[PDB]
Amino acid sequence: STSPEIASLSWGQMKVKGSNTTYKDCKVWPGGSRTWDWRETGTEHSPGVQPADVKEVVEKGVQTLVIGRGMSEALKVPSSTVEYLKKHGIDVRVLQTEQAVKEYNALVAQGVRVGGVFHSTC
Template sequence: MIGHYQFGAMTVGGKIYRNDLKIIDDEVISRWWRREGHTCDIEDVQDILASGPETLVVGMGQPGRMHVTDSLRKVLKDARIELIEQPTAEAVQTFNRLHGRGKRVAGAFHLTC
């Protein structure tokens, strides 16, 4: 599904995106902004939570500066949604592997730091 990632750019379905993005049920939501820049909290992924994936893969940026809040971790655990947090290059590989296996996987990707 994700064709390529490099710092600041990701190719999905042949289209290049240059802003943070989410992927939910094969739909790309571009220009993903979080309430706090390097923090991913519940309100930042409400649409993902509503879609009910098995797994949420979060790309934390190339060096991994973004982090998931404890409150989001709890909500995901209570909803039985597995959370995988990795630097974005690794998260892309994980997302593609899970998607290729037919898993209901959603992604939230920070493309830069």
Template sequence: MGLDRDRHRALPGIQPADVEELLARGATVVVLSRGMRLRLEVDPRTLTLLRERGVEVRVAETTEAVRVYNELAGTTAVGGLFHSTC
């Protein structure tokens, strides 16, 4: 029996509560990974929250998200949420 790909869609995705710790720790840029196959969604309320707080948001596939995070980590208060599957 195979994996039901539609059922496995990661909804409702990254929620505002998921980024609260990053904000509390002073992140000025947040990198959000949507997974290797871009199946994890980002709740629009999460993006709104980050932008309202003046935080730059980068959303990408996991490999790209890791690259962006590493590029910024030496010079920027960056936080990240990385989804390794999907």
């Protein structure tokens, strides 16, 4: 399957191509996407994105994983998380979300198996 393009991003709102649902935060992978909800993992801005947050993207099979860490990058990303993805042979991009969605879609556009997790507020 193909990584869907992210169709729109604005404050606290995201749309994935071929999704029925307007998300706030989301996970996106080859073949689909889901709402990202910190309550499922107990993720806060600190210590931030956990392996548990990205696990379900990893297990879909991606070469590259983009983390959109928010509009002003207030959401931290522990290095143990990034190293977790690297052990799994994944190219990781950590960026402010606008720049994340932009990178993500360029990877989609060059037919890379790309996934990601995006935070659309602070």
